[PDB]
Amino acid sequence: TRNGRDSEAKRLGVKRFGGESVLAGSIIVRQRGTKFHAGANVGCGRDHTLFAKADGKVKFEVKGPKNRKFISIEAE
Amino acid sequence: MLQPKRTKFRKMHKGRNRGLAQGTDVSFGSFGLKAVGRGRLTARQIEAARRAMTRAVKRQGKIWIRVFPDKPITEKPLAVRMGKGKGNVEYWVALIQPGKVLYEMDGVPEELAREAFKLAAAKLPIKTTFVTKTVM
Amino acid sequence: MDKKSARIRRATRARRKLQELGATRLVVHRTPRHIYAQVIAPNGSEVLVAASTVEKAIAEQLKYTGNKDAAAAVGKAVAERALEKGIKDVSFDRSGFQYHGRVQALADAAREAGLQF
Amino acid sequence: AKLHDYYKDEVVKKLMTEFNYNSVMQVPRVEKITLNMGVGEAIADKKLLDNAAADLAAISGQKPLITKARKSVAGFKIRQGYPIGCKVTLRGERMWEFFERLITIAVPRIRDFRGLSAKSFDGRGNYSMGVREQIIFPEIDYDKVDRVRGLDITITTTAKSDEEGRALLAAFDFPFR
Amino acid sequence: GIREKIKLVSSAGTGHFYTTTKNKRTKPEKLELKKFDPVVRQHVIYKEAKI
RNA sequence: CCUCCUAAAGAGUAACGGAGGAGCACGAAGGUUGGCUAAUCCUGGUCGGACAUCAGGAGGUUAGUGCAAUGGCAUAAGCCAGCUUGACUGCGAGCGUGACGGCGCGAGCAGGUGCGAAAGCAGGUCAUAGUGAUCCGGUGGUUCUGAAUGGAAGGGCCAUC
RNA sequence: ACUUACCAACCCGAUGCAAACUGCGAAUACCGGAGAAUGUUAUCACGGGAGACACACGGCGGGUGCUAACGUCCGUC
RNA sequence: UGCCUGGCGGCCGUAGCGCGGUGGUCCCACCUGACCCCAUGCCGAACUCAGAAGUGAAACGCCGUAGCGCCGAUGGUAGUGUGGGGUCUCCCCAUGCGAGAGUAGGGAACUGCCAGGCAU
Ligand SMILES: [Mg+2]
Ligand SMILES: [Mg+2]
Ligand SMILES: [Mg+2]
Ligand SMILES: [Mg+2]
Ligand SMILES: [Mg+2]
Ligand SMILES: [Mg+2]
Ligand SMILES: [Mg+2]
Ligand SMILES: [Mg+2]
Ligand SMILES: [Mg+2]
Ligand SMILES: [Mg+2]
Ligand SMILES: [Mg+2]
Ligand SMILES: [Mg+2]
Ligand SMILES: [Mg+2]
Ligand SMILES: [Mg+2]
Ligand SMILES: [Mg+2]
Ligand SMILES: [Mg+2]
Ligand SMILES: [Mg+2]
Ligand SMILES: [Mg+2]
Ligand SMILES: [Mg+2]
Ligand SMILES: [Mg+2]
Ligand SMILES: [Mg+2]
């Protein structure tokens, strides 16, 4: 039947890019699935939000046999 | 009259018809009818041209149609204001960029293929050129 | 899945969690004929201590190399060698095998000998 | 136990000399015997499946597994998870004790028996056959059987070809055509 | 919708209660679960009652 | 209210633009420990067929996910079993997203709990819809208040309708 | 069961098409760090006072319409 | 020090698949037995325990081999930021950036810790 509907934009995406200094707890990426996976010092929330578990620099990296994206936190 | 048998979606955004063609070589027959222009070919134009060249070769040889009208075209009727939803699909076009080989032929002498293509070209809204098969 | 691949799959989750926690792990390997034990540093690329039934010094005082008694011997051996190098706190990695029989005998022996897990 | 001994002492000997294998481990072995009862009509009468299970349990001395519908199909009017049959996987002593009972007393009691087919091989050595009456098995009582049922018998072997698979069964003097 | 609100009351005597929903048709039996009672500061058995 | 495209490779972005879905469900369909791995095609097989159940081979997640879409998912988030109630109470470094009201994510601390030998995991469900401010009133609790005083009514505070 | 000037999915080779396809993938733009020069602090916070929430055309990228409109609706200058 | 094997990693197809060959003293595997520990919505298949009669058949490791996967220039082409221009639905010029596909070619991995067998 008729169209006309759409939902509110969920403001997902990368909140802190590579090199950015973050304090423990800071959301690095809001995503729907695990487009990025949690690496060293990075936690994964119930809505697959990746967050900092320790103060430091955001590091993006491709690891493993499945060539997956990982967000980690390097000490600064 | 050519048309997709089924489609994922009924209607499609207008879009643009920028760039040069893909499929610029006689890949199946000995001769071709290449587009030099940019435009849309309707399913009726494609058929009209196909009929002309077929009658010309007295249904000897083999014909290939390298284009397919997979683009749905909508239209608002008379006495209808703007808005109130996208119009209804009326016909199907194939976007044509300069270089597209439209039709291909083999099994006929060059002179005949040239005439058949001259006759089909007159049914088309865009400028064409006769092309021959090449070694690479 | 074939026996080996099926076992590695069974072992992957725990090993990734141990990697994440940065824990020193006591890795056990079992075979119909032999039982092995290695204490691997959190990096996973270097062995701190090891003991097995392929070792002439251990196999000599055992009836059969692939039984619960041999497993308890390998267990006592790693813990003793680990404690001589100051390694006290570890995490047991059953490596896809059930925590039972031979694997259990090795872990209960290491716990007895003084290893903390 | 009798036919496993017969395999070891006389069948291996026969096959090795027939195909000229470099190793004894190349010799086709009888891997497993799978008995299956496709009830199908259990959807109307649930009790019918239970009798098919109790029948299979008498034939092979082990509790049958009641197989459920893998996917729903409109053709037979069945929904996913419906008990639509029962199977038994036979291995070791029970496989051999059954294999002897099949050749020695069950298969000879088939109505107007002349010999089972030798062309019903899956193309990779494994043999598939089907019984029409379950009363051929002396473990089943004619006076107590509610209905006349049949079952599928599949002999899974380590044979690489049908030629090899044929020779493994023929060596057990399996009643062929 | 066809699911009703129910209260789980503390057996510890304290007025404390948890609140949940229940499909009264499919599951007619009274719901029993061990839950933490913040008044006695211990895990006690809780039993279903009307909301 | 939710999902995709339009949306111009951060976020956001309009139209009576193009397509769909929600206004629930689940005491297990939740937690944990242990295990398991689809679709589809070919060959063989009682009744039995294009398709039911059984066996082998190819295949390699195209399956599955309570439901729309998209992103995820094998270490499975998919499927099964044992034990269970973490579908805990108080809090919360630090963040995201909003004009605001709000909404969301969160390691960690305290008390108490379940599962596991243990490392550990659990503050519901793969995630994102499943909703209703305030007022007024109802029910239970309460070191609060109690118009001379002691009570009480009524009010507050906590829970909830 | 046998067979046919018909139709024919899958698979292989060849050829195209896609806003709601992607085993590829820019230019730009955007986020963060450091450094100089320049710029009447241009920046942030708090406080006093507003106006404004009918926009228009032109360029580029689009939706809609007929790649019609001095049309209509977004983005960006 | 060399060869061989097992375990745990790095790396994540130049590393994989296929085809051919090859290995059992040791290791690994299949294997033998199963009352029991423990196990099967049935089954000692798997999980598991007690072993050593057999075999490297399968698997696994190693060696070889460009049928496939995979990696992949140079040059040209497509696009595009800025400035300019035309016949302005689309293009062109100056400048900077510069794909994707295809072509030549590469390619039968490389590497660390520990342990065991053998040899000098
Ligand atoms: Mg965007
Ligand atoms: Mg953008
Ligand atoms: Mg679930
Ligand atoms: Mg698990
Ligand atoms: Mg069939
Ligand atoms: Mg415990
Ligand atoms: Mg008074
Ligand atoms: Mg008073
Ligand atoms: Mg201000
Ligand atoms: Mg207004
Ligand atoms: Mg306005
Ligand atoms: Mg405007
Ligand atoms: Mg205007
Ligand atoms: Mg075995
Ligand atoms: Mg071999
Ligand atoms: Mg370059
Ligand atoms: Mg590139
Ligand atoms: Mg390239
Ligand atoms: Mg390529
Ligand atoms: Mg070469
Ligand atoms: Mg050595």
CB B66 within 8 A of CB B103: yes
Ligand nearest to the CA of D92: 14
- CA B126 to mean position of chain CA atoms: 10
Task: Return phi, psi of residue B35, to 5°.
Answer: -80, 135
What is the identity of the amino acid at D53?
A
- Decide: helix, strand or coil at residue D101: helix
Q: How far is CA C58 from CA B86, C35, C105, D56, in A?
A: 84, 11, 16, 52
CA of D73 to C1' of H116 (A): 58
Task: Return phi, psi of residue E31, to 5°.
Answer: -70, 130
Strands (E), chain A: 13-14, 21-22, 27-30, 36-38, 42-44, 50-52, 56-63, 68-74
C-alpha radius of gyration, chain E, whole number: 11
Whole-angstrom Cα distance, residue A47 to residue A27? 12
* CA–centroid distance, residue B86 to ligand 10 (Å): 28
- Decide: helix, strand or coil at residue B57: coil
Two structure tokens written together for D78: 């069945």
Cα separation of the two ends of chain D: 27
Q: Which residues does D176 contact at the CB level (< 8 Å), separation at least 6? A: D115, D116, D117, D118, D169, D170
Residue C56 burial class via C-beta count within 10 angstroms: exposed 0-12, middle 13-18, buried 19 and up: exposed
Task: Return phi, psi of residue E43, to 5°.
Answer: -85, 110
CA of A7 to C1' of F130 (A): 15
* DSSP letter (8 states) at residue D142: T
Q: How many CA atoms lie within 13 A of D8 on its CB side?
A: 6
Q: Which helix (H) or strand (E) holds B47?
A: helix B43-56
Nearest nucleotide to the CA of E14, by C1', is F141
Whole-angstrom Cα distance, residue B7 to residue D172? 61
Question: Is C44 near strand H, with its CB below 7 A from some atom of it?
Answer: yes
Whole-angstrom Cα distance, residue D164 to residue D28? 7
Q: What is the CATH number of domain C1-117?
A: 3.30.420.100
Q: How far is CA B34 from CA A26, B2, B17, B120, C74, in A?
A: 60, 19, 17, 12, 81
> E4-10 and E42-50 as β-strands: parallel, antiparallel, unpaired?
antiparallel
CA of B91 to C1' of G65 (A): 17
* Residue indicated by tokens 């059954």: D98
CB D161 within 8 A of CB D21: no
Whole-angstrom Cα distance, residue B99 to residue B97? 6
Cα dihedral D143, D148, D152, D155 sign:
positive
Whole-angstrom Cα distance, residue C75 to residue C39? 11
* DSSP letter (8 states) at residue D147: S
Q: Give the determination technique.
A: X-ray
Which of A46, A54, A60 lies closest to A15, judged by CA?
A60
- Decide: helix, strand or coil at residue D61: coil
Q: How far is CA E21 from CA B21, E25, E33, E36, E51, in A?
A: 63, 12, 14, 18, 9
CB C51 within 8 A of CB C34: no
How many CB atoms are located within 10 Å of the residue C81 CB? 17
Q: Which residues does C102 contact at the CB level (< 8 Å), separation at least 6? A: C30, C35, C66, C67, C68, C70, C71
Question: Which chains share 3+ C-beta pairs under 8 angstroms with A?
Answer: none
Whole-angstrom Cα distance, residue A7 to residue A15? 21
Question: Is B96 near strand G, with its CB below 7 A from some atom of it?
Answer: no
**Plot region of D153 (φ>0 → left; ψ -120 to 50 → alpha; else → beta):** beta
What is the identity of the amino acid at A75?
A
Q: Which residues does D63 contact at the CB level (< 8 Å), separation at least 6? A: D57
Q: Which residues does B20 contact at the CB level (< 8 Å), separation at least 6? A: B97, B98, B99
* CA–centroid distance, residue C83 to ligand 17 (Å): 55
Question: Which chains share 3+ C-beta pairs under 8 angstroms with D?
Answer: none
What is the identity of the amino acid at D139?
E
Whole-angstrom Cα distance, residue E26 to residue C13? 38
Whole-angstrom Cα distance, residue D100 to residue D122? 23
Question: Is B82 near strand G, with its CB below 7 A from some atom of it?
Answer: yes
Question: Is D32 near strand H, with its CB below 7 A from some atom of it?
Answer: yes
Whole-angstrom Cα distance, residue C70 to residue D136? 52
Nearest nucleotide to the CA of C104, by C1', is F117
Q: Which helix (H) or strand (E) holds B40?
A: strand B39-42
Which of B100, B115, B126, B82 lies closest to B24, judged by CA?
B100
Question: What's this structure's resolution in Å?
Answer: 3.1
Whole-angstrom Cα distance, residue B74 to residue D57? 69
What is the identity of the amino acid at B56?
A
Which positions on strand F lie below 7 Å from a protein C-beta? 1-7, 10-13, 15-21, 23-28, 34-37, 39-40, 43-57, 70-77, 84-90, 93-98, 104-107, 111-113, 117-121, 124-128, 140-142, 159-161
Question: Closest residue to F98 by CA to C1' distance?
Answer: A11
Two structure tokens written together for D129: 């056959």
Whole-angstrom Cα distance, residue B89 to residue E33? 61
Which of E22, E28, E26, E27 lies closest to E6, judged by CA?
E22
Whole-angstrom Cα distance, residue B72 to residue C34? 71
> E17-22 and E4-10 as β-strands: parallel, antiparallel, unpaired?
antiparallel
Whole-angstrom Cα distance, residue A21 to residue A38? 17
Ligand nearest to the CA of C55: 21
Q: How far is CA C94 from CA B28, B72, C13, C67, in A?
A: 63, 62, 12, 16
Ranges of each domain in chain C? 1-117
Q: Which residues does D121 contact at the CB level (< 8 Å), separation at least 6? A: D127, D128, D162, D165, D166
CB C82 within 8 A of CB C16: no
CB D103 within 8 A of CB D173: yes
CA of A5 to C1' of G51 (A): 36
Whole-angstrom Cα distance, residue B21 to residue B99? 5
Which three-class secondary structure string do you get for D72-92?
CECCCCECCCCECCEEEEECC
Nearest nucleotide to the CA of A21, by C1', is G32
Q: Which helix (H) or strand (E) holds D18?
A: helix D12-19
Domain range enclosing E7: 1-51
Which three-class secondary structure string do you get for chain C?
CCHHHHHHHHHHHHHHHHHHHCCCEEEEEECCCCEEEEEECCCCCCEEEEEECCCHHHHCCCCCCCCHHHHHHHHHHHHHHHHHCCCCECEEECCCCCCCHHHHHHHHHHHHCCCEC
Task: Return phi, psi of residue B2, to 5°.
Answer: -70, 150
> A50-52 and A27-30 as β-strands: parallel, antiparallel, unpaired?
antiparallel
How many CB atoms are located within 10 Å of the residue E40 CB? 14
Which of D130, D118, D129 lies closest to D170, judged by CA?
D118
**Which domains does chain B show, CATH number per domain?**
21-136 (3.90.1170.10)
Whole-angstrom Cα distance, residue D104 to residue D97? 11
Q: Gap positions in chain D, given as the residue before each gap (C–N > 2.5 A)?
A: none
Domain count across chain E: 1
Whole-angstrom Cα distance, residue B25 to residue B58? 25
* DSSP letter (8 states) at residue D7: I
* Residue indicated by tokens 């089909």: B120
CB C39 within 8 A of CB C71: no
CB B89 within 8 A of CB B11: yes
CA of B18 to C1' of G60 (A): 15
